[PDB]
């Protein structure tokens, strides 16, 4: 468990580790937006 005064952020921290995956996905949205050029 996190320190008491950051407890509010618990559900954010459950999701943070996944964020690097989203960068990979985001490169494919970008390439879709320029038509895989």
């Amino acid at each position: 468990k996190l320190p008491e005064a950051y407890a509010i952020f618990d559900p954010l921290v459950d999701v943070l580790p996944v964020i690097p995956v989203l960068f990979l996905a985001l490169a494919f949205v970008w390439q879709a937006a320029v038509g895989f050029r």
């Binding site: 559900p11 954010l12 459950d14 999701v15 996944v18 964020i19 989203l22 960068f23 996905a25 985001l26 949205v29 970008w30 937006a33 320029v34």
Partner: peptide, 27 residues
């Protein structure tokens, strides 16, 4: 839930492409 935050975070990236493509930017 956590489904609120990952929705908010999940939309950031695509919203950046959207803003840049409608404002015809250096994509």
């Amino acid at each position: 839930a956590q489904l609120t935050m990952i929705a908010m975070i999940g939309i950031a990236g695509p919203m950046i492409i959207f803003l840049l493509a409608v404002r015809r930017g250096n994509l």
